């Protein structure tokens, strides 16, 4: 609810993008911390990690908070005004207005 | 580039005839029966290879090929931002393909360079096919 | 090295241009050394050389020196600003920028 | 003289201005570095410098290591082809050429 009411004049189709490029950096930093642990200088048997660590098991906020940083609107001010002039273009109700029927 | 197995066969052949075609001084008129020497005792060279290469064979290949380039990451060196985004936008959906499974995220299917004409494009786009050891 | 920072704003498609202009400019000399080697004055068997000589071996410094005379940047700076200014067309992560999610 | 080569297509009136970005950007420092000498926590008479310290006498190195990077050429390469185009508008000796008296 507090990422929806901060982007404001966001279209559909850009805050569709904005939930892949945060999971395109979360599996940029799952992909990196797979290196070190196989790459561990000497690789012993002692203390070894049977268990899987998942340093990123799921989206984390900060995620969000850096993925965020690249956000655009696509969608400008002065062509939105272009279909609220066509909608004008349509007379849309204007005229006399309310009249009654006699009684 | 360009041959295929019969015009090699015939650069073959063509180099063996000029290695022929050198020794006339021994194989004369004279001796119309050709004696057992030259038959076992002549050994083409390179300057031969390189004569039947260049005088003749006309490729018959004008279509497309596939291979894996040779060209490496060093080749140009630098643009390190450039690197990490072509490995993330090529490598990984190949190398790991069940952490995109994981959390859903589908690969993208081609970016568009944009540059000043002549600063290495092909020389950089042929670079991830062949880390990659992609067609 | 001081080949390289010498070359400043020059493209990658032109200074691949004078190491092609070098090679030519000592294949030239090494040609031209070969017409008077054989066309000494009274060429006697006395004090010849039986060896190679090989004045050109490798390229030197001066074709170097003299290659980079020619030298011309083909891109400008008037059209390197207009792919700096389409990467301005793109928004380029402005607007808001960072945000901090409530605690 | 590594200053002097280095800088190649800058015009008279560029070049006179980093010359002057250094020396701004050595008075912001000594100015600052006064600030903290007056400002020190519990200025006793104890361990006093009563010598001046110092701290930028001069123009150091990094000075204009540091001023270069803002640099910028101010004439292109497309407008000093139009002064070479109207040294082409003279005629500039061109036409017959070497001719000799007879003998």
Same mark, same amino acid.
């Given at each position: 609810?507090?990422?929806?009411?901060?982007?404001? #004049?966001?279209? #559909?189709?850009?805050?569709?993008? +904005?939930?892949?490029?945060?999971?395109?950096?979360?599996?940029?930093?799952? +992909?990196?911390?797979?290196?070190?642990?196989?790459?561990?200088?000497?690789?012993?048997?002692?203390?070894?990690?049977?268990?899987?660590?998942?340093?990123?098991?799921? +989206?984390?906020?900060?995620?969000?908070?850096?993925?965020?940083?690249?956000?655009?609107?696509?969608?400008?001010?002065?062509?939105?005004?272009?279909?609220?002039?066509?909608?004008?273009?349509?007379?849309?109700?204007? #005229?006399? #207005?309310?009249?009654?029927?006699?009684? | 580039?360009?041959? $295929?197995?019969?015009? %090699?066969?015939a650069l073959c052949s063509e180099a063996a005839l000029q290695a022929i075609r &050198?020794?006339?001084?021994? *194989?004369?008129?004279?001796?119309?029966?050709?004696?057992?020497?030259?038959? @076992?005792?002549?050994? $083409?060279?390179?300057?031969? !290879?390189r004569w039947a290469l260049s005088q003749s064979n006309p490729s018959a290949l004008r279509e497309t090929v596939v291979? $894996?380039? /040779?060209?490496?990451?060093?080749? *140009?060196?630098?643009?390190?931002?450039? &690197?990490?985004? %072509?490995?993330?936008?090529?490598?990984?959906?190949?190398?790991?393909?069940?952490?995109? %499974?994981? !959390?859903?995220?589908?690969?993208? &299917?081609?970016?568009? !360079?944009?540059?000043?004409?002549?600063?290495? &494009?092909?020389? %950089?786009?042929?670079? *991830?096919? @062949?880390?990659? /050891?992609?067609?």
């Amino acid at each position: 609810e507090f990422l929806a009411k901060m982007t404001n #004049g966001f279209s #559909g189709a850009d805050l569709t993008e +904005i939930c892949q490029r945060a999971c395109k950096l979360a599996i940029r930093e799952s +992909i990196e911390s797979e290196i070190r642990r196989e790459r561990e200088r000497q690789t012993n048997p002692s203390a070894m990690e049977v268990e899987e660590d998942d340093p990123v098991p799921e +989206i984390r906020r900060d995620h969000f908070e850096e993925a965020m940083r690249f956000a655009r609107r696509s969608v400008s001010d002065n062509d939105i005004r272009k279909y609220e002039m066509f909608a004008q273009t349509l007379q849309q109700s204007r #005229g006399f #207005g309310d009249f009654r029927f006699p009684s | 580039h360009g041959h $295929v197995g019969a015009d %090699l066969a015939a650069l073959c052949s063509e180099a063996a005839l000029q290695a022929i075609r &050198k020794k006339m001084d021994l *194989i004369d008129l004279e001796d119309e029966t050709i004696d057992a020497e030259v038959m @076992n005792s002549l050994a $083409v060279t390179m300057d031969d !290879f390189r004569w039947a290469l260049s005088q003749s064979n006309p490729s018959a290949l004008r279509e497309t090929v596939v291979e $894996v380039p /040779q060209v490496t990451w060093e080749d *140009i060196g630098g643009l390190e931002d450039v &690197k990490r985004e %072509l490995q993330e936008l090529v490598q990984y959906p190949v190398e790991h393909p069940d952490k995109f %499974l994981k !959390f859903g995220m589908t690969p993208s &299917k081609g970016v568009l !360079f944009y540059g000043p004409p002549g600063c290495g &494009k092909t020389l %950089l786009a042929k670079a *991830i096919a @062949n880390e990659c /050891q992609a067609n």
